């Protein structure tokens, strides 16, 4: 049948993503050009490059882990098969991916009131925010016997009060620090807080 160089590798994604690195997957081009697919040749282009950049001319499986990305720039990656007659056509992947991921936890949670029906919270911003400017925090509670944590404020400023609360019972407090990418694992509040006063 046909004589060429091959088809474009199949179904090219990103598979995962750091603020250093993304791995990608694909699968075998369709049609190989009528001669065996020898390697996969791997490339980058951070989005304001107009040129691609090499990242593996001998790539013998369908994914790859491209690393030493910088943080907060988005980048094109591109994957084509080779046979003996040459590079193949190119899979690209449809959309920028930016380099970043979910941020840290906030600072130190600080209890700044207690009353009978509230308590009033305090936090300082994430060491770091994993490349993606942080778009708000989620405040969740756990109320004494319950074997359930509950959102119960959703701020985009470092501080919450919490109202509604039953007084002389227990409660304990958590935040998360949110970003496009993913929300940080929580810091919980050192000491539970009685309602009182």
């Known amino acids: 049948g046909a004589m060429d160089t091959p088809g ?25 050009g009528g001669s065996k697919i020898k390697n996969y040749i791997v490339e980058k282009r951070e989005s304001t490059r107009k040129a691609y950049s090499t990242v593996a001319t001998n790539c013998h499986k369908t994914s790859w882990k491209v690393d030493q990305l910088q943080e ?23 959309e920028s991916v930016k380099a970043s991921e979910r941020p840290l936890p906030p600072g130190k949670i600080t209890l700044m009131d207690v009353t009978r029906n509230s308590v009033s919270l305090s936090w300082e911003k994430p060491e770091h925010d994993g490349g993606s400017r942080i778009l708000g925090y989620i405040v969740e509670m756990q109320t004494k016997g319950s074997d359930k944590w509950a959102t119960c404020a959703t701020v985009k400023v470092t501080e919450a009060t919490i109202t509604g609360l039953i007084q002389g019972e227990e409660y304990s407090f958590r935040v998360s620090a949110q970003n496009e990418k993913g929300i940080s694992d929580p810091r919980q509040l050192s000491v539970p807080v009685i309602a009182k006063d």
């Open 8 to 32: 474009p590798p199949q179904d090219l994604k990103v598979k995962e993503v750091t603020k250093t690195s993304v791995t990608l997957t694909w699968d075998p081009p369709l049609l190989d």
């Open 72 to 94: 907060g720039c988005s980048y094109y990656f591109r994957v084509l098969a080779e046979n003996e007659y040459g590079i193949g056509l190119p899979a690209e992947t449809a």
